[PDB]
C-alpha cells in the first residue's frame, strides 16, 4: 500500500554550558534508517538499517553536511524563539521539526509535511496544499511573514514532491526484502481466573510489521468495549510490534467472546476463540 519517509529533529538548550543537544532520526514507514546525535563521537549521519549501508561516501558526506547545518539552524531558532517569547537565558527549551512525504497506492506523490513545535506545542506547519502556513500565535505569525517573503513553501514543495518521493522510492527498492514485506501478527489467547465466577481472556498479537493494527472483542457477534483493556502498540526491539486486548467474562461463557484482528499482513481479518 502507501509508504512514507519522515525525519524527526529535536534540539534542547543547555543554559549551564555549551550548545544544544541535537538528535535527528530518519524513518521509512516504521523502520529507522539513519541517526545523528550531536553528543556522539562520530559527528556523522550514521546508518541504522542494513539497506542504507549500500549508499556510498558521497551520500554520507552530503547527509552529514546537511544534518550539521540543520543542527546549527535549530540552535539559532532556540535563540530566536527565546526572544519572541521574551524568555530568559536561564531555562532549557525544546524545538522539534518533522518533515517528509507519502507515496500512495499508485506509487506517486500523495502528501507532504513540514511542521515545527516549540516547547511541545504547535508553532508553524505547512498546510496540505504545500502553499500556505498555519501559525499558532503571533510569534509564529512573524515566522510566517519571513517564510512567505523568502518563498520557503515553494522550496519545500519542490523537495517534497521531487527529491523526497524519488529517494523514498529508491530506499523502498534497496530495502525491499524488509520494507516491502508485511509480517502478519502471531496471535493467541490466554485465560486467567480473577474470582471463581469471572475470567480474563487476553488476545495477543506479536511480531507484526508495520505497527498499524486493530484488535477488538465481540460478544455474540457484536462489538464489546465494556470491561475491556487495550495496551498501546509497543516495539518488540527487533523491528516488529506487539499489542494485546483483554476482556473480563463470566466463567463458563468464554465461547461467546471472539477476538478480531485486522492487519495489512492478513488477507482477511482473523477471528480467535477460546
Amino acid at each position: 500500500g502507501s509508504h512514507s519517509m519522515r525525519y524527526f529533529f529535536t534540539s534542547v538548550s543547555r543554559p549551564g554550558r555549551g550548545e544544544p543537544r541535537f538528535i535527528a532520526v530518519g524513518y521509512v514507514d516504521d523502520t529507522q534508517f539513519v541517526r545523528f546525535d550531536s553528543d556522539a563521537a562520530s559527528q556523522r549521519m550514521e546508518p541504522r538499517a542494513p539497506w542504507i549501508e549500500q549508499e556510498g561516501p558521497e551520500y554520507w558526506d552530503g547527509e552529514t553536511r546537511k544534518v550539521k547545518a540543520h543542527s546549527q539552524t535549530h540552535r539559532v531558532d532556540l535563540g530566536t524563539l527565546r526572544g519572541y517569547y521574551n524568555q530568559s537565558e536561564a531555562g532549557s527549551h525544546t524545538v522539534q521539526r518533522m518533515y517528509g512525504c507519502d507515496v500512495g497506492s499508485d506509487w506517486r506523490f500523495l502528501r507532504g509535511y513540514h511542521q515545527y513545535a516549540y516547547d511541545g506545542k504547535d508553532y508553524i506547519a505547512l498546510k496540505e496544499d504545500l502553499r500556505s502556513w498555519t501559525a499558532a500565535d503571533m510569534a509564529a505569525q512573524t515566522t510566517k511573514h519571513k517564510w512567505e517573503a523568502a518563498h520557503v513553501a515553494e522550496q519545500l514543495r519542490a523537495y517534497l514532491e521531487g527529491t523526497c518521493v524519488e529517494w523514498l522510492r529508491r530506499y523502498l527498492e534497496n530495502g525491499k526484502e524488509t520494507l516491502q514485506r508485511t509480517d502478519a501478527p502471531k496471535t493467541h489467547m490466554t485465560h486467567h481466573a480473577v474470582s471463581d465466577h469471572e475470567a480474563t481472556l487476553r488476545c495477543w498479537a506479536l511480531s507484526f510489521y508495520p505497527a498499524e493494527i486493530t484488535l477488538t472483542w465481540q460478544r455474540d457477534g457484536e462489538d464489546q468495549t465494556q470491561d475491556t483493556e487495550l495496551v498501546e502498540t509497543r516495539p518488540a526491539g527487533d523491528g516488529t510490534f506487539q499489542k494485546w486486548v483483554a476482556v473480563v467474562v463470566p466463567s463458563g461463557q468464554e465461547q461467546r467472546y471472539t477476538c478480531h484482528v485486522q492487519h495489512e499482513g492478513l488477507p482477511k481479518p482473523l477471528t480467535l476463540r477460546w
Binding site: Y7, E63, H70, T73, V76, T80, W147, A150, V152, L156
Partner: peptide
C-alpha cells in the same frame, strides 16, 4: 535524503 536547506524561524 535530507532537505538541501532548512529555513530558520
Amino acid at each position: 535524503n535530507l532537505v538541501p536547506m532548512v529555513a530558520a524561524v
